[PDB]
Design an enzyme around this catalytic site. Structure first.
Site, PDB file in Angstrom:
ATOM      1  N   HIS A   1       1.994   4.100  -3.028  1.00 48.74           N
ATOM      2  CA  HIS A   1       1.759   5.526  -2.829  1.00 48.74           C
ATOM      3  C   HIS A   1       3.035   6.240  -3.259  1.00 48.74           C
ATOM      4  CE1 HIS A   1      -2.058   6.376  -1.045  1.00 48.74           C
ATOM      5  NE2 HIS A   1      -1.892   5.576  -0.008  1.00 48.74           N
TER       6      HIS A   1
ATOM      7  N   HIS B   1       0.829  -1.203   0.000  1.00 52.96           N
ATOM      8  CA  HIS B   1       0.000   0.000   0.000  1.00 52.96           C
ATOM      9  C   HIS B   1       0.863   1.253   0.000  1.00 52.96           C
ATOM     10  CE1 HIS B   1      -3.643   2.379   0.890  1.00 52.96           C
ATOM     11  NE2 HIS B   1      -2.790   3.162   1.527  1.00 52.96           N
ATOM     12  N   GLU B   2       1.955   1.206   0.752  1.00 57.06           N
ATOM     13  CA  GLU B   2       2.843   2.351   0.853  1.00 57.06           C
ATOM     14  C   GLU B   2       3.736   2.508  -0.367  1.00 57.06           C
ATOM     15  OE1 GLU B   2       2.118   4.316   3.521  1.00 57.06           O
ATOM     16  OE2 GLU B   2       0.606   2.738   3.690  1.00 57.06           O
TER      17      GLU B   2
ATOM     18  N   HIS C   1      -5.560   6.405  -3.505  1.00 55.95           N
ATOM     19  CA  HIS C   1      -6.536   5.544  -2.840  1.00 55.95           C
ATOM     20  C   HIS C   1      -7.703   5.241  -3.766  1.00 55.95           C
ATOM     21  CE1 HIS C   1      -5.192   6.948   1.440  1.00 55.95           C
ATOM     22  NE2 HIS C   1      -4.479   5.925   1.006  1.00 55.95           N
TER      23      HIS C   1
ATOM     24  N   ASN D   1      10.091 -15.913  -8.544  1.00 59.53           N
ATOM     25  CA  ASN D   1       9.790 -14.540  -8.136  1.00 59.53           C
ATOM     26  C   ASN D   1      10.304 -13.526  -9.160  1.00 59.53           C
ATOM     27  OD1 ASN D   1      12.504 -15.033  -7.665  1.00 59.53           O
ATOM     28  ND2 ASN D   1      12.596 -13.642  -5.903  1.00 59.53           N
TER      29      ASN D   1
ATOM     30  N   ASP E   1      26.305  -1.786 -11.809  1.00 60.76           N
ATOM     31  CA  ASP E   1      26.116  -0.522 -12.502  1.00 60.76           C
ATOM     32  C   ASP E   1      26.829   0.584 -11.757  1.00 60.76           C
ATOM     33  OD1 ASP E   1      23.235   1.415 -13.751  1.00 60.76           O
ATOM     34  OD2 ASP E   1      25.372   1.885 -13.621  1.00 60.76           O
TER      35      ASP E   1
HETATM   36  C1  LIG Z   1      -6.582  -0.156  11.320  1.00 58.58           C
HETATM   37  N1  LIG Z   1      -5.655   0.811  10.704  1.00 58.58           N
HETATM   38  C2  LIG Z   1      -5.802   1.086   9.399  1.00 58.58           C
HETATM   39  O1  LIG Z   1      -5.604   0.279   8.488  1.00 58.58           O
HETATM   40  C3  LIG Z   1      -6.291   2.506   9.087  1.00 58.58           C
HETATM   41  C4  LIG Z   1      -7.796   2.344   9.088  1.00 58.58           C
HETATM   42  C5  LIG Z   1      -8.686   3.555   8.834  1.00 58.58           C
HETATM   43  C6  LIG Z   1      -8.460   4.649   8.098  1.00 58.58           C
HETATM   44  N2  LIG Z   1      -9.529   5.455   8.138  1.00 58.58           N
HETATM   45  C7  LIG Z   1     -10.490   4.922   8.897  1.00 58.58           C
HETATM   46  C8  LIG Z   1     -11.792   5.325   9.269  1.00 58.58           C
HETATM   47  C9  LIG Z   1     -12.569   4.490  10.117  1.00 58.58           C
HETATM   48  C10 LIG Z   1     -12.037   3.259  10.586  1.00 58.58           C
HETATM   49  C11 LIG Z   1     -10.737   2.870  10.203  1.00 58.58           C
HETATM   50  C12 LIG Z   1      -9.955   3.713   9.345  1.00 58.58           C
HETATM   51  N3  LIG Z   1      -5.745   2.916   7.763  1.00 58.58           N
HETATM   52  C13 LIG Z   1      -4.428   3.129   7.500  1.00 58.58           C
HETATM   53  O2  LIG Z   1      -3.502   3.016   8.331  1.00 58.58           O
HETATM   54  C14 LIG Z   1      -4.133   3.516   6.040  1.00 58.58           C
HETATM   55  C15 LIG Z   1      -3.402   4.865   6.040  1.00 58.58           C
HETATM   56  C16 LIG Z   1      -3.070   5.376   4.640  1.00 58.58           C
HETATM   57  O3  LIG Z   1      -3.867   6.071   4.022  1.00 58.58           O
HETATM   58  N4  LIG Z   1      -1.874   5.007   4.183  1.00 58.58           N
HETATM   59  O4  LIG Z   1      -1.449   5.398   2.954  1.00 58.58           O
HETATM   60  C17 LIG Z   1      -3.253   2.434   5.334  1.00 58.58           C
HETATM   61  C18 LIG Z   1      -3.868   1.023   5.297  1.00 58.58           C
HETATM   62  C19 LIG Z   1      -5.066   0.991   4.342  1.00 58.58           C
HETATM   63  C20 LIG Z   1      -2.841  -0.025   4.850  1.00 58.58           C
HETATM   64 CA   LIG Z   2      26.484   2.490 -15.747  1.00 61.26          CA
HETATM   65 CA   LIG Z   3      14.529 -15.857  -7.664  1.00 62.61          CA
HETATM   66 ZN   LIG Z   4      -2.884   5.232   1.832  1.00 63.26          ZN
END
Ligand SMILES: CNC(=O)[C@H](Cc1c[nH]c2ccccc12)NC(=O)[C@@H](CC(=O)NO)CC(C)C
Ligand SMILES: [Ca+2]
Ligand SMILES: [Ca+2]
Ligand SMILES: [Zn+2]
Ligand SMILES: *[C@@H]1O[C@H](CO)[C@@H](O[C@@H]2O[C@H](CO)[C@@H](O[C@@H]3O[C@H](CO[C@@H]4O[C@H](CO)[C@@H](O)[C@H](O)[C@@H]4O)[C@@H](O)[C@H](O)[C@@H]3O)[C@H](O)[C@H]2NC(C)=O)[C@H](O)[C@H]1NC(C)=O
Ligand SMILES: *[C@@H]1O[C@H](CO)[C@@H](O[C@@H]2O[C@H](CO)[C@@H](O)[C@H](O)[C@H]2NC(C)=O)[C@H](O)[C@H]1NC(C)=O
Ligand SMILES: *[C@@H]1O[C@H](CO)[C@@H](O)[C@H](O)[C@H]1NC(C)=O
Ligand SMILES: *[C@@H]1O[C@H](CO)[C@@H](O)[C@H](O)[C@H]1NC(C)=O
Ligand SMILES: [Ca+2]
Ligand SMILES: [Ca+2]
Ligand SMILES: [Ca+2]
Lengths: 120, 416, 129
Positions: free
Chosen positions: B143, B139-140, B149, B212, B288
């Site tokens: 980003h 997810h990161e 999102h 992989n 490289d």
């Molecule tokens: C349980 N912790 C989570 O996964 C919360 C959940 C959350 C976000 N908004 C909310 C509103 C109501 C209830 C729960 C939440 N989300 C995150 O940490 C997300 C943060 C983000 O946008 N990373 O890019 C990244 C994640 C998706 C991997």
């Molecule tokens: Ca080179």
């Molecule tokens: Ca391999």
């Molecule tokens: Zn996010």
């Protein structure tokens, strides 16, 4: 040895006046009075106490402009946010120093004020 | 499909997870998270190759606060001043136990891949729920590759794709309609150069894994899974060479035969790059190497830096468009105030003003010549993305001088 | 932009407080909750106009953030005759080393005032993000 009217001390000539006027007029005045004359300067309590009595004896008002004007207009400045000071907008008003006989200390007063002069 | 991309990743385990400093167990969890991540990134041809792992057993090199935004920022500045200087790598993640506020599980910078201060990310380890942790890492990193999102109408077979703003209890392993497109848009715009060639098998620290799509030590070759393998000379399963082939993958492999010595296996991309030729002993092109840092580039409009030739004018264009350019020195004086946007280095989140000699290394100011304006000192700032907007390290601040990775306008000869 | 309770001018936000404080106190108060804040600096004629319009738009005197350096009371001034300032007996409470803006002048003139006096002020804080 100083001319008539003027008293001598150390190595200079003093002369009180009742002609009340603002700091600038009081300065330009002292100069027209005698080549090399300016508002009194004080480099020691000794000279000070001398000018004090000169007033008490000759002058009516218990104070006089001394010789410092526009006290905090040309200083080194800077803003509290560490920024540099390029732009300035200092009001024309400004402070000058006066000495009060009695308490024999120094006070700040707008150079607009009208007080007695004491050349030297 | 997408071009094969490789992310040379270095993971940092903070004091929280370094409590039981004893490695072994941790790494096993890490290796599995990573591998899981690649399984998620497969449909996008993205391969994260772990070339390093550090532990903060002694102390936490930066204050890991409850604020995810604060910690990331601090981590980014560290990754640029400390890590980068020591070890070479593309991106860096910080694995922690820390319970950040707002329930956040991970955080990173948008389209920051390859950038010194912004090619970083934070990830809260979900105990032993390895796969749920992999999703976060994915997810990161996404980003960080310009992916946003999932909104109103973005679809996947799980109804809960990787880029959902909310991590489900049984997160999908599939990317969304919108994500694929966002990524494609990221590549044609930022054109990241630090993610095209994989690291030498020698340098990958993750235990080898066949299929992989990552040629590792011990593997004869690797065209991935038997499902999506089109390599006429590699066993899609046992990662072994087919009948008559000397190699399966490598820049020094042609028609399935090792290229002869002296033959160029990797040309010079720009003037800040040095070519590599095959040794003739292996299908893997030698490490490289880029031009010597400091070497003038762009007709002395700058000096090489880890492969690129940073120039203020271009960074202004990146931020404000084609109609932008660097502002007049006068503007950079705002960097002495140690303002919220005008500063240089930061110590414990505290912003420190620049010495009069390093004003060209703090916040970048541009003269965006786009109507409606009224400010000749345009600058970019976001409290959630403060590094972007600062002068790119490596930039030429004065003839013979460049900004180092610590917001200082030092002398090229001494910076390298 | 910043809709906390102030006006916006080129990346910074200007809030106006009606609490009477000393220069020292004001500055100290400008950099606390309204973080990074400081007393209004005026670096250009344009900004000068801005702060004035702001104060006019208000429903006394205000603290400018300008301060004096160098540990010399007289700064660089000397007696009108030319001699340096040997003897100095100006009580501290006689100093007027701070500056304020005032309605009479249209809030576009910097007047000296005792830093210890208590006036109104205007902080120049960062914008919400
Ligand atoms: C349980 N912790 C989570 O996964 C919360 C959940 C959350 C976000 N908004 C909310 C509103 C109501 C209830 C729960 C939440 N989300 C995150 O940490 C997300 C943060 C983000 O946008 N990373 O890019 C990244 C994640 C998706 C991997
Ligand atoms: Ca080179
Ligand atoms: Ca391999
Ligand atoms: Zn996010
Ligand atoms: C200390 O007191 C002095 C005098 O009491 C103040 O000086 C006076 O300052 C004003 C400006 O605020 C001058 O007025 C200007 O006058 C000119 C015309 O020239 C002058 O005309 C007068 C008569 O009209 C003559 O006596 C003068 O010699 C000179 O020729 C005019 O064009 C301007 O528009 C303006 O009105 C005034 O002349 C000046 N007085 C003199 C001659 O000294 C001074 O401001 C004050 N300073 C302090 C410390 O507050
Ligand atoms: C991903 O696919 C979805 C659906 O396949 C696209 O969303 C459609 O958007 C149109 C807009 O006119 C709607 O009328 C449809 O109802 C939507 N589809 C449904 C039923 O969900 C979406 O646009 C695609 N993502 C993008 C923007 O590429
Ligand atoms: C934040 O961490 C640094 C070490 O990186 C430390 O010096 C500082 O004191 C910490 N913050 C506080 C206020 O404890
Ligand atoms: C400040 O001035 C603007 C126009 O210059 C006006 O719209 C606003 O109402 C004023 N502030 C208040 C709340 O009176
Ligand atoms: Ca593939
Ligand atoms: Ca790389
Ligand atoms: Ca002199």
């Amino acid at each position: 040895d100083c001319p008539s009217g003027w008293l001598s001390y150390e190595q200079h000539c003093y002369k009180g006046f009742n002609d009340l006027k603002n700091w600038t007029d009081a300065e330009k005045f002292c100069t027209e009075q005698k080549k090399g004359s300016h508002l009194v300067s004080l480099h020691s309590r000794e000279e000070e106490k001398f000018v004090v009595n000169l007033i008490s004896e000759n002058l009516e008002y218990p104070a006089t402009w001394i010789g410092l004007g526009n006290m905090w207009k040309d200083c080194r400045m800077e803003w509290s946010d560490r920024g540099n000071v390029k732009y300035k907008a200092l009001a024309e008003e400004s402070y000058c120093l006066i000495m009060i006989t009695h308490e024999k200390v120094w006070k700040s007063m707008t150079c607009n004020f009208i007080a007695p002069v004491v050349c030297k | 499909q997408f071009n094969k991309i490789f992310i040379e990743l270095v993971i940092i385990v903070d004091h929280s997870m370094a409590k039981k400093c004893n490695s072994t167990a941790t790494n096993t969890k890490i290796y599995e998270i990573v591998n899981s991540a690649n399984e998620i990134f497969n449909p996008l041809n993205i391969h994260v190759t772990l070339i390093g792992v550090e532990f903060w057993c002694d102390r936490d090199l930066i204050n890991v606060t409850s604020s995810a935004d604060e910690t990331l920022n601090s981590f980014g500045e560290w990754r640029a001043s400390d890590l980068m200087t020591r070890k070479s790598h593309d991106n860096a993640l910080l694995f922690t136990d820390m319970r950040f506020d707002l329930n956040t599980l991970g955080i990173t910078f948008l389209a920051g891949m390859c950038q010194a201060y912004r090619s970083v990310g934070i990830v809260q380890e979900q105990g032993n729920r390895n796969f749920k942790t992999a999703v976060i890492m994915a997810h990161e990193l996404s980003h960080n590759l310009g992916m946003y999102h999932d909104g109103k109408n973005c679809i996947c077979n799980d109804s809960s794709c990787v880029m959902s703003p909310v991590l489900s209890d049984q997160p999908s392993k599939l990317f969304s309609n919108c994500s694929i497109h966002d990524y494609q848009r990221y590549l044609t715009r930022y054109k990241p150069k630090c993610i095209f060639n994989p690291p030498l098998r020698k340098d990958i620290v993750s235990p080898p894994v066949c299929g992989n799509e990552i040629w590792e030590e011990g593997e004869e070759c690797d065209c991935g899974s038997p499902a999506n393998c089109q390599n006429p000379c590699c066993d899609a399963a046992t990662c072994k060479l087919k009948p008559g082939a000397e190699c399966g993958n490598g820049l020094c492999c042609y028609q399935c035969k090792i290229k002869t010595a002296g033959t160029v296996c990797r040309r010079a991309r720009d003037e800040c790059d040095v070519p590599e030729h095959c040794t003739g002993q292996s299908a893997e092109c030698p490490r490289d190497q880029l031009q010597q840092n400091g070497k003038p580039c762009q007709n002395n409009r700058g000096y090489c830096y880890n492969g690129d030739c940073p120039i203020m004018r271009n960074q202004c264009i990146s931020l404000f468009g084609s109609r932008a350019n660097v502002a007049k020195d006068s503007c950079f004086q705002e960097n002495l105030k140690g303002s919220y946007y005008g500063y240089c280095r930061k110590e414990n989140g505290r912003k420190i003003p620049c010495a009069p000699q390093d004003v060209k290394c703090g916040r970048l100011f541009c003269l965006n010549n786009s109507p409606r304006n009224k400010n000749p000192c345009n600058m970019h700032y976001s409290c959630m993305d403060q590094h972007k907007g600062m002068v790119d390290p490596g930039t030429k601040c004065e003839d013979g001088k460049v900004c180092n990775n610590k917001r200082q306008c030092v002398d090229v000869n001494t910076a390298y | 932009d910043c809709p906390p309770d102030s006006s916006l001018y080129r990346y910074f936000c200007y809030r106006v407080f009606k609490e009477h404080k000393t220069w020292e106190a004001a500055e100290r108060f400008c950099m606390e909750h309204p973080n990074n804040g400081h007393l209004v600096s005026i670096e250009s004629m344009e900004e000068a106009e801005f702060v004035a319009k702001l104060l006019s738009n208000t429903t006394t005197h205000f603290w400018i953030g300008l301060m004096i350096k160098d540990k010399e009371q007289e700064c660089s001034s000397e007696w009108s005759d030319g001699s340096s300032v040997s003897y100095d007996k100006l009580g501290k409470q006689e100093f007027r080393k701070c500056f304020v803006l005032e309605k009479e002048s249209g809030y576009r003139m910097w007047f000296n005032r005792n830093c210890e006096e208590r006036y109104l002020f205007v902080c120049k804080v960062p914008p919400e993000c």
